[PDB]
Ligand binder design. Sequence first.
Ligand SMILES: *[C@@H]1O[C@H](CO)[C@@H](O[C@@H]2O[C@H](CO)[C@@H](O[C@@H]3O[C@H](CO[C@H]4O[C@H](CO)[C@@H](O)[C@H](O)[C@@H]4O[C@@H]4O[C@H](CO)[C@@H](O[C@@H]5O[C@H](CO)[C@H](O)[C@H](O)[C@H]5O)[C@H](O)[C@H]4NC(C)=O)[C@@H](O)[C@H](O[C@H]4O[C@H](CO)[C@@H](O)[C@H](O)[C@@H]4O[C@@H]4O[C@H](CO)[C@@H](O)[C@H](O)[C@H]4NC(C)=O)[C@@H]3O)[C@H](O)[C@H]2NC(C)=O)[C@H](O)[C@H]1NC(C)=O
Ligand SMILES: *[C@@H]1O[C@H](CO)[C@@H](O[C@@H]2O[C@H](CO)[C@@H](O[C@@H]3O[C@H](CO[C@H]4O[C@H](CO)[C@@H](O)[C@H](O)[C@@H]4O[C@@H]4O[C@H](CO)[C@@H](O[C@@H]5O[C@H](CO)[C@H](O)[C@H](O)[C@H]5O)[C@H](O)[C@H]4NC(C)=O)[C@@H](O)[C@H](O[C@H]4O[C@H](CO)[C@@H](O)[C@H](O)[C@@H]4O[C@@H]4O[C@H](CO)[C@@H](O)[C@H](O)[C@H]4NC(C)=O)[C@@H]3O)[C@H](O)[C@H]2NC(C)=O)[C@H](O)[C@H]1NC(C)=O
Lengths: 208, 208
Amino acid sequence: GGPSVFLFPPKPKDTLMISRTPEVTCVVVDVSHEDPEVKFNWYVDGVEVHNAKTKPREEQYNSTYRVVSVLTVLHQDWLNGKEYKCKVSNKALPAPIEKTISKAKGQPREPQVYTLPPSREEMTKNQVSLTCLVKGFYPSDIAVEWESNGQPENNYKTTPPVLDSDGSFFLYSKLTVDKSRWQQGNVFSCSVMHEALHNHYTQKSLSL
Amino acid sequence: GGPSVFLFPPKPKDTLMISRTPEVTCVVVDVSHEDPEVKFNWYVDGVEVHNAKTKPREEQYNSTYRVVSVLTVLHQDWLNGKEYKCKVSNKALPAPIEKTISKAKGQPREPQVYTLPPSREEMTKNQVSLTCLVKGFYPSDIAVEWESNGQPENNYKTTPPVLDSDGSFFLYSKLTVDKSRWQQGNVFSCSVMHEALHNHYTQKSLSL
Ligand SMILES: *[C@@H]1O[C@H](CO)[C@@H](O[C@@H]2O[C@H](CO)[C@@H](O[C@@H]3O[C@H](CO[C@H]4O[C@H](CO)[C@@H](O)[C@H](O)[C@@H]4O[C@@H]4O[C@H](CO)[C@@H](O[C@@H]5O[C@H](CO)[C@H](O)[C@H](O)[C@H]5O)[C@H](O)[C@H]4NC(C)=O)[C@@H](O)[C@H](O[C@H]4O[C@H](CO)[C@@H](O)[C@H](O)[C@@H]4O[C@@H]4O[C@H](CO)[C@@H](O)[C@H](O)[C@H]4NC(C)=O)[C@@H]3O)[C@H](O)[C@H]2NC(C)=O)[C@H](O)[C@H]1NC(C)=O
Ligand SMILES: *[C@@H]1O[C@H](CO)[C@@H](O[C@@H]2O[C@H](CO)[C@@H](O[C@@H]3O[C@H](CO[C@H]4O[C@H](CO)[C@@H](O)[C@H](O)[C@@H]4O[C@@H]4O[C@H](CO)[C@@H](O[C@@H]5O[C@H](CO)[C@H](O)[C@H](O)[C@H]5O)[C@H](O)[C@H]4NC(C)=O)[C@@H](O)[C@H](O[C@H]4O[C@H](CO)[C@@H](O)[C@H](O)[C@@H]4O[C@@H]4O[C@H](CO)[C@@H](O)[C@H](O)[C@H]4NC(C)=O)[C@@H]3O)[C@H](O)[C@H]2NC(C)=O)[C@H](O)[C@H]1NC(C)=O
């Protein structure tokens, strides 16, 4: 009917990488052509802030607009658990819509990072699987990459985080390599970024 | 507004286990108190069938009913890729709603099942991780369990299937065991059920 609001968190990497810019994004869909004006109020821990920026209005081909406000967050503010509230007013609403988002609550726990070599049974294939088990972490926001000889290794896939029986998360990352590249003693590494790691970073190596 | 329809597939286990009964479920929500009658037509490969059964009507506390029709499917029919169509008629609809479901399309590929022992680095803990990598499978419907000494081992978690770079799926299953149970040479097994396995079943063992 009238507008709907969806509020999105930053990317885990952006909150953990010094390079990138974490932002909270408040998306308003089904804004009418009759009432395209939307007012945003933003609050951080209940304190109203005034540095949000509205993205270019996006007109959809179902006769609605999509209007989006972005609030840049301090890395430390997000990781410290601050509460971000977006309030949306529009003439087609009988009352403003409010959404609130934050990092998951609970004591952070440091990932344990374990590298597992290919199974002997897999050595009948041309390509073999290098496994990085990351477990015991909380909250679930995390990033995982691989390297080899100082260079990024990109032929990998990582599972979503899975809730474990002790209330931490685990996941696995699988890097696929030419078997010969493995047999030649090349050194591979699994890099993990998470808030409860020293400098938000660790790497563990794996080689034959 | 008026009713909505959601059509659900069988459980992978039910389609792969000789014991259990696979069914397709056509769920109609937001059925009004003014118009509670819903007519279902079911089609298998475009052929109308007449052996569906309607579940007991469920009245919700938002002044709507939930009405559900269940069609039992032959194991072989689902795995052979038959198309199941549910057609829903109701007075509040301007036209019937139709939904169609089937198994994912594409050539099946047999899972490769590899067991990986705990990392040496993990042996500083009281509990260690036994890993079952299942890869190269298609379609994604699969079930995984663990055993030890002929008995079911239940302290495990399995990742959802992840789409790999070659268009097959992989996943990992993690069984957590007392370290001493591992060091004592107990034999653990990862059991996998999938349509492209011989007898829809395989198991691989792991021990120190
Ligand atoms: C007219 O046409 C319109 C265009 O087609 C159409 O608009 C759509 O409306 C939909 C609803 O009507 C709306 O659906 C929601 O989608 C949510 C997910 O949205 C993302 O992912 C989509 C698919 O991948 C994308 O299309 C979206 O753009 C969005 O993508 C994300 O965007 C964010 C913000 O930009 C971005 O994050 C930012 O990224 C940047 C970098 O780019 C930085 O990193 C920033 O730091 C960062 O903030 C993401 O990266 C990007 N991600 C992706 C994957 O692309 C979805 O979550 C909603 O689901 C909830 O609500 C529905 C009910 O509608 C429930 O069915 C569902 O279960 C979910 O409900 C929640 O469940 C929770 C339970 O765990 C519960 O806790 C919650 O309370 C509960 N909430 C609710 C409300 O129930 C939802 O499906 C869709 O996004 C719109 N599409 C577009 C393109 O705008 C419109 O509907 C049409 N009008 C008609 C038909 O009348
Ligand atoms: C009045 O109050 C009502 C009750 O609260 C409320 O009813 C709800 O309405 C919702 C929509 O308005 C409806 O939402 C949909 O939910 C879908 C998932 O439903 C399941 O999982 C839920 C949460 O876990 C459960 O609540 C549901 O019961 C259902 O659970 C499953 O049930 C099936 C069938 O029984 C069962 O399978 C069977 O199990 C048995 C054993 O028990 C056997 O094994 C059988 O063999 C087997 O068949 C499952 O096990 C069971 N699973 C679980 C997990 O419990 C959800 O999938 C829908 O999402 C789609 O649509 C929404 C739009 O509404 C999108 O936002 C979303 O992105 C999805 O869209 C799809 O996206 C695809 C992209 O990949 C795309 O390909 C599709 O085209 C696209 N489709 C559409 C339509 O867009 C959806 O969220 C909810 O289920 C209702 N809840 C209940 C309890 O009925 C009602 O709304 C209220 N009225 C109001 C507010 O006015």
